[PDB]
Amino acid sequence: SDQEKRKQISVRGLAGVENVTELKKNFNRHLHFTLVKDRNVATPRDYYFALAHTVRDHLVGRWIRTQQHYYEKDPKRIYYLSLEFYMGRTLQNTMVNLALENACDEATYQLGLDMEELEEIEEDAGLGNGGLGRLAACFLDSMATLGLAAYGYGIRYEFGIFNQKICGGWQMEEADDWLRYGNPWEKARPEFTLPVHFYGRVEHTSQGAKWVDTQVVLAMPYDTPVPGYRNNVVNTMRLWSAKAPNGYIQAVLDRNLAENISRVLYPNDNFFEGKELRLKQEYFVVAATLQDIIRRFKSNFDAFPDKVAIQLNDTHPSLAIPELMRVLVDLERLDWDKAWEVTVKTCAYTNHTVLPEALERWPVHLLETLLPRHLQIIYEINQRFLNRVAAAFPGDVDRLRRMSLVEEGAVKRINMAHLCIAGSHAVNGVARIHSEILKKTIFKDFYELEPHKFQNKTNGITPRRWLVLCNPGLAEIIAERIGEEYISDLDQLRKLLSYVDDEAFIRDVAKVKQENKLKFAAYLEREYKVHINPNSLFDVQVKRIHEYKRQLLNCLHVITLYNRIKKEPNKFVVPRTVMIGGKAAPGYHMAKMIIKLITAIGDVVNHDPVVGDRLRVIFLENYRVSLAEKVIPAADLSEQISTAGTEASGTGNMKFMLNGALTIGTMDGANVEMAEEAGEENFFIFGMRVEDVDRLDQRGYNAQEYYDRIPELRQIIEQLSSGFFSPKQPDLFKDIVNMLMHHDRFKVFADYEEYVKCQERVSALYKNPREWTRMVIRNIATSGKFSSDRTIAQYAREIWGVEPSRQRLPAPD
Amino acid sequence: SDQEKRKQISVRGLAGVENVTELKKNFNRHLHFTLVKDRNVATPRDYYFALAHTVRDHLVGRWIRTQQHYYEKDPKRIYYLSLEFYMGRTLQNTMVNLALENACDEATYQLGLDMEELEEIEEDAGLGNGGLGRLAACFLDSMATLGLAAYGYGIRYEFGIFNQKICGGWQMEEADDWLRYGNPWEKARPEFTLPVHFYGRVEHTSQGAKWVDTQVVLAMPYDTPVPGYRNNVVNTMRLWSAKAPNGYIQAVLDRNLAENISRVLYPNDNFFEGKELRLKQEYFVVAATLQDIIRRFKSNFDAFPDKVAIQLNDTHPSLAIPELMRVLVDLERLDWDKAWEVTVKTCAYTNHTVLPEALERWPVHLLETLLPRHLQIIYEINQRFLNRVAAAFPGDVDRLRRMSLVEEGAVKRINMAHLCIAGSHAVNGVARIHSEILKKTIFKDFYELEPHKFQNKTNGITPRRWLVLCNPGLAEIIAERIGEEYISDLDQLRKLLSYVDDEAFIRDVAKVKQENKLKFAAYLEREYKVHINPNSLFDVQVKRIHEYKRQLLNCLHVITLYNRIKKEPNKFVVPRTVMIGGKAAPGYHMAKMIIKLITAIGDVVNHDPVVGDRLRVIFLENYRVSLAEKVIPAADLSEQISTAGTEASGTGNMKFMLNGALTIGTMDGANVEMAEEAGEENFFIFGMRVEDVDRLDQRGYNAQEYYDRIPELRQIIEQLSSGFFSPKQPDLFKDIVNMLMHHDRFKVFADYEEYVKCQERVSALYKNPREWTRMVIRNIATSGKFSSDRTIAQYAREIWGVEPSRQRLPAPD
């Protein structure tokens, strides 16, 4: 008896075979016994939670079977360390991946409820800034769908990326209290809390180095399940929360200082801010993550790289290299050389930008007092690494200074990217053009030393959330000709090329875009009382505000469209609704000025009676994942106009392509590969290429030359300077004008002419609905290469050494 | 259809008819779907949580039916405002009150688990300091058992009363992270959050006063169910949590300043510390509580007192009087006189102490800047109140100065007790002697003005937790002769007097005490590796450390016992294990010195070979509700030796009586009434009475007179002064000695002789087990008057105007 009796404790049978009667039963139970409510006081929100909990049961049932399966099989495990995971909404995603959607729709319907109304109660889990954070989220969805034993590790921020409010045309920041009503998907794990150390000092006893006199901060994990598509695999995303360890009153209040580490996500995108709190956050997630990994590995180290793969999402968790060394040498007492071997073979680094001001260079004075032992370990790694460089290039002292992990100057700094390259067995770019730039520019030296380390892994988006979820209409007209296999094998959309001349398909593609455009216009009016003509070309640019992303270039074109209608008021032009959305880092002046200019322009354009509904400029407030799932499926033209060579890859570009929009962009990042897949004849490429940018830099960029040679451009600048877009404050945009004229690192003027002319070609094709639609079909049909399933499959095979699999596990019962 | 379909959403059927098969089914479900665990990684803690959640379902089912019942019936509602609620453990209490104990025991047993091991995983919810907080908790249990529509309102402190650690014989404080693993009984209610205002100013517009420019702090309620005994009534305890309202990073971090209000419970017992954070806490709970009340009342004000009763647990929530006035006058715009009428008729005040240093007197300068409008309203109430006094006693200006709510001096202060008396329709003491003292001393003036307002409501404890729960053995031997009716009608224990000469009952009473003593000794050894002789008289004094509670007097007796054994080493003495436990307010020097003396004494006594097991002094570390439920049932002698007139009532005294221990105490608080109920011949009363204390104060207390006249006392003092109990630091107790000799406000020396002689009488009776046991039976049988059911019944009938009821509601299904 005894222990044998506990065998009754089994997931054996769960909340149901996945059908209406049982779903309704559990919905009722959760509404009363979980939310402590009844049908008389229950609000739609209470009803959304009851459905979320009901659906979560089915998820957990598989979550448990999956982890049990991993413990038994013991596959090599993959850990994706990221300081960001932009997850978005979970209810619908879960229902879709688990095939619960239809049954849940019926169950709620029978209970006198509307599921879509319920689904809309859920807001985003915005623990990310944008591209980097959302890539991680797409990766999590893909690894689960590919049957990989992967874990996402990050920080559980109390407040994610701020909510953007537009006041008087300016961005205002409001904390994103995403946990106000709780989070039904996560599961706190206090029983697994681990300690993280800070400050202290290092003493060298007779048997090694000891990091003593430190301050401790606990890391409590919160687990979130990530369901693969219909394979019954549910992986985990473990996020750490900071806790203080365990006069009198003030001492208890001061416990807040330690828990401040996981309070808020730094709202910077592609920019480095050397703040100690940020450094604490990076080591916080790293220290706790590696403990959890080595522990999970234990329940000697020669086989560590065979069972463990740690992927560094940018340099943010780079401290993982000296930490893993610290643990192996100082605690496990492995000899240095063996520890290092294990370390390099375990880690791999992914770079996401080439812009200098985004790269992390921590002052050593900050590292010596906060993580003394790590600074020591880093110097040693540096000395040994440089010794190898010296050996491979005798006499090349200059190369030694260039590759050193240490930068000299008034302020000594540690170049975290160099650290990542040294301690990683693989370094990879996120787009072919980006990966090549890394090999001939910023990382040329390292590439020359270890060519074998450098790879490329072109980004991708998950077709689940970014097609099946956000664009059900498109997903169904597609499914009715080629089936549903494409959903987890996107390269099958290639079959659609067989319908480029099919009248029924052309009709359906255009009708779905129009329904989406119609639906989006009804959403804008509803929540923001904003009107937009649905029978106009939806010109959309949504991404974070950046000088490099050149929202300003888009602004110049808008005013050019406006001026042209004022010059020839009665001439016909294809109606346009230009939409620009995105947030600016709070401290990014130019970015905030750019947002004001956009609204300022809309203020003039939108109220000019002569213009009417021929042109409308709208700034989409609070752009986020949930909004992207809304506006992107209703887009016609996708703006991807970053200066050639500045956008590592981009993913928004991919979202638009899969959703029926045509692209106008530069030969930058993945734009290059999307054009290659669809054919340049089906794309709208324009402007300078990387070479043209470089040549201009050699001779020198003089924006005045373009000003003096382009009349329409002169007029626009004169309007901005004049106070034409700010009558009550004539010099309001003086900062934007001077930047463009004398300090524009992104050459907006240099691409203006080719940009406007290319925009003319867009309107031309739009005037011909049938041809426009047909070109779109050629795009949608060639977007398969950009499925995150493809990207993860490569990481798995070329970096992690694990074979992807679509094998499905049996349902819980 | 439609709305009619939602009728399917019902509590109709719940987790089970209250039997094994279904209990096991839900235990399994919760273990996997709620805790996300499986039988392979599940720890006893995970198993305790699975059982707690399983049991909670049955509680919630009734919780929902009860509130639905109240909305339909619309009875007058009773709100018990307290800054403290010392609840303790909930699992067993719930199982008992719901009659789930046996079935749950069997279900767990069948699943290969031990419920008692599981129950011991649960720790206290120590949101209280001691007596006052635990009285509220007993009151909550009783109101539910008496079928009253009552709500407990307080603050949800992140950290309750600190955990006490003894290091080097001294008390060390450690934050009580009671929420580390979560709380399965509460239910957060973010959807019911309310705003609380602070600071600001008052401007007087043409239509009234306006409190503007304030700072806002949100109050989010967390509901906890309180089950009555087998009547299917589950009331609510709603506790408020502080939340901040909704550069950039620092602004988000600073949100901690607002949430600090509900961070920690001030650890002071019977002492006032005029800290702004404390004042914020008092208004925090008051402001949010009254909003919730008026709101619940709305879903004109002449009938407010007919549907609402607000009971002020001490002066802590006294701001409820000016707040209710503020709301009625400033917001509801009622004329002053009508508002006041409604206010007095709604509120009632309970006083818990006569000691001056416990009474709240807030400096006006603190009130004007923090709650300006309330200071204004208070002055107006004062002027109008004094005008009435002036009218009732013309020319008595001195009485005006004495009764004023405002105290003049260098530092102007508001006497909160006077405020409570003025704005309450009833004021009550917590014990007959206490209530009389209030009428002839500190509140004589007010009593003279409004004799009708003053009442008495003798405290009481709940027989559920304090007998059926903590002492199952006693509860069963009692149940086998008179049944179980006494459980909710304690006056039935009177029937036991019929067994004072029954050999079987005498045998059983003594055997149960011995089993408890045996069990307690096994608990002490287990967790604290402390040994105690179970065949010795268990002399126990557990309560907070206070000079007034005179733990020191007990210390003098212990050393007297020690010295006597050293004087006549071979003379026989009844073996004793003296136990003293309790916490000292962190800043209470004397109290901390008293704790050290106790351990210091144990250090000498416990290691003296000549003494051996004839005497053992033990300091019970971290005394709390859960420990009280352990040590009290194993006690033989209950120490209640406060100076006559200082202990308002006491409740520990009541706990011991109901559990089979004899009492040695002064004629103080409820000790007076317990002796009256059992008969002084069955009690051990000693020392000065209130009159004797007062006479000594008239002529003057000279401790040297007792020192010079009592040889044994001189010896003890000489030992303390000598360094006999602190050889490494001879003058360590100089503070205790000097206090006793020259500044002892509690006259420990004055009661020493009568105390020791009375202790001689105790040992005498113990030498005769049969007679001791028989006296105990006379105590247990006369403890019925001290059931909190009796106390709540009186409040209900004499103050709240609601009739108590034992009518049971139908089970959820």
Ligand SMILES: CN1CC[C@H](c2c(O)cc(O)c3c(=O)cc(-c4ccccc4Cl)oc23)[C@H](O)C1
């Ligand atoms: C000279 N000065 C200009 C502004 C810049 C700066 C700030 O002062 C504050 C910020 O929040 C940002 C930001 O988010 C992104 C970028 C950035 C990033 C990549 C390429 C070019 C730029 Cl300008 O720059 C920022 C920094 O102080 C250097």
Ligand SMILES: CN1CC[C@H](c2c(O)cc(O)c3c(=O)cc(-c4ccccc4Cl)oc23)[C@H](O)C1
């Ligand atoms: C003169 N001085 C003595 C100590 C006293 C004091 C403190 O400085 C600090 C404290 O934490 C307490 C406490 O908890 C209880 C009592 C108290 C309560 C009732 C009766 C008698 C006393 Cl001494 O007094 C405290 C205050 O400063 C006045």
Ligand SMILES: *Cc1c(COP(=O)(O)O)cnc(C)c1O
């Ligand atoms: C996909 C996504 C991004 C990335 O957009 P890019 O144009 O590649 O920079 C940014 N923000 C959100 C909300 C996204 O969904």
Ligand SMILES: *Cc1c(COP(=O)(O)O)cnc(C)c1O
């Ligand atoms: C009942 C109780 C008290 C009250 O004890 P008194 O001796 O009346 O002061 C204090 N603390 C705890 C833990 C209690 O259970």
Ligand SMILES: OC[C@H]1O[C@H](O)[C@H](O)[C@@H](O)[C@@H]1O
């Ligand atoms: O790789 C994910 C993303 O990282 C950064 O946001 C880059 O700016 C972007 O080009 C890339 O797509």
Ligand SMILES: OC[C@H]1O[C@H](O)[C@H](O)[C@@H](O)[C@@H]1O
């Ligand atoms: O009324 C509850 C308790 O309040 C205070 O703690 C008093 O010290 C005590 O005598 C009383 O029993």
Ligand SMILES: *[PH-](=O)([O-])[O-]
């Ligand atoms: P069960 O033991 O989980 O199937």
Ligand SMILES: *[PH-](=O)([O-])[O-]
């Ligand atoms: P049901 O409508 O709760 O019984």
